Structures are given as C-alpha cells and as structure tokens.
Amino acid sequence: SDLGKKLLEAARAGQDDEVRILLANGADVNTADETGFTPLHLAAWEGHLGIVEVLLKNGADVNANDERGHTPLHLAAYTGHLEIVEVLLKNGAGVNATDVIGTAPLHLAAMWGHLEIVEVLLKNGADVSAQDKFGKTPGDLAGDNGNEWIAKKLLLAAAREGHREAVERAIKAGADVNTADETGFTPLHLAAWEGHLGIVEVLLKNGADVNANDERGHTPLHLAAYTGHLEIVEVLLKNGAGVNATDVIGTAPLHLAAMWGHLEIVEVLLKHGADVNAQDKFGKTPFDLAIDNGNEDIAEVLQKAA
C-alpha cells in the first residue's frame, strides 16, 4: 500500500505531475487512509482543480464516504471552491447526501455563506427541506447565522420547488415575504406558477402584495392563469388582486388564460369583471389569440360576454 500513501501526499500537496506517473503505474484511485479520505477528498480540500479532473476521468467515485460520512461534495462546500462544486455535480454526485448528523451540502454551503455554491445546488435538484438530527434547515442555518441575503435566496427556492414546511419557519425568523430575485419574482409568483397552493394562502395570510410586479410587470395572477391551476386564481381574486393588470406587452390574465385553453379560469376572470376589449401590444384580443391557436371553446365563451 506504499503507492496509496504517496498518492495521498501528492494529491494533497498539489503536484499533479506525480499523480500522472503513479496512476499510469496502476495505483488505486480510491485508496483510503485511516480516516477514509480518497484522493478526491484531499484534492477538493486544498483546492487543486487540476488533480480533481484527473481523478474523475480515470474512475474515482464521486460519492466517496470517509469515516465521518463526508462525500467529496461535502468538503467542496466547506472550503468555498466554486469551481470544484460544479465538477462533482456534473459527474453525478449526491446533491442531498447526508452526514453522520444528516448535514447535506446545502447545509454547509449556507452555513459559511457561499452564495454561488448554494445557487448551483438548487439548480441540480437540492431539497431545501432536508433535515439533520438537530432539526435545523439551511433556512434556519442562514437566518440565525446572519446571512439574510442567503435566507432570501433559500426562501425563493423553497417556494419554487414546493417545500411548504421550510417556509413559515423562515418568516418566523424575520425573512421578507416580498423579497425578489434577479427577474423580480416574489415567493407569491413562484408558488402560483408551479401550482403548489399550500404557500399561496399562508404567504397571503402574512401580508404579501398580491399585485406585485416583476422586472417585466408580471403579477402572480398572470402566472396562475397560464399553467391552468384554477384553485390558485380563485384565492388571488378573493383578496382583490389586479385582474386588468398587464405587463410591458399589454398582456392581461385573460390574454394568457385564453391562449392555452383554460375554460374554468376564463370564466372566473369574467366573474370578477374583466373587459374583453383589452389588447396586447400587437392589437390582439383574447378572442383572436384563441382562434389561431386551435381552441374554439374559449373564443365562444368570451363572444357571449362581448
């Protein structure tokens, strides 16, 4: 096992050239010392991007467990090397790998304040509601530690993915219910777009702006009529959400509801009192967009109202 101890000292030191000589000689790429660290762990700790790509292309397991239950992704979120976190994820690493306590890479990335590391985990399907042994969520790890900006980015991912439990606790921690992302989507937009009704009423009960606009003037009432979730449009209109509100292109929720074929939504929009006369920037009424699309039932229902 002399080739493995010199491989661990070469992968930790950063001499990538000695790794090439020893791997071509037949050294095990997944040799574990007394602690269980594979060369992929030590290279992800010291931050040598060159050695990691060599170990991953010859057959190093991307989910190598040490004695403490740390995968190379767990050590990649703790050090803060953004370039190393995405290389492991593209090879098929565990986005929600647990620790001895149950700590996932989403927990460690939000604990030390690595925002760009937290953002890449959320793209690869990370569970924000993942719980460890003590009952602390990355939303709790972010709001208590003092990283309120990371708590906003974590609250937004929870409303988009659909984890209802990890939301009200962050509001109890002082999180902003009207916080927006890069495009302006509040958690009210993300909850009505994916069709997860459970946050729509509880976020509405705390005091979220129902007629809030994004960077392009899109209110959450527009998104509810687009996907066709009728049970969400009824709750939004119950509180007095703007039904005649349009975006920068003049697109009303009636324009979106008539394009995709949602008869039960078009009726409830006409129930609260919406004008068919509204047009977009192309001079197109909800009647004309339903004719070319291939959906005549909506065109006939508004024709009876016109």
Residue numbers in the entry: 12 to 317
Sentences from the paper on this structure:
The two helices are not just joined end-to-end, but instead the two domains are made to overlap in such a way that the joining helix is stabilized by contacts with the domain cores along its entire length.
In the context of DARPin-β-lactamase fusions, we observed that the paratope of this DARPin has a high propensity to form major crystal contacts, leading to crystal formation under a wide variety of conditions. Indeed, constructs D12_Hxx_D12 with H02, H09, H11, H13 and H15 yielded diffraction-quality crystals in space groups P212121, P6122, P212121, C2 and P1, respectively, at resolutions ranging from 1.8 Å to 3.5 Å. Two such dimers pack into a barrel-like unit. The purple molecule in Fig. 5b shows the C-terminal DARPin packing against the green N-terminal DARPin, the pink molecule the N-terminal DARPin packing against the green C-terminal DARPin.
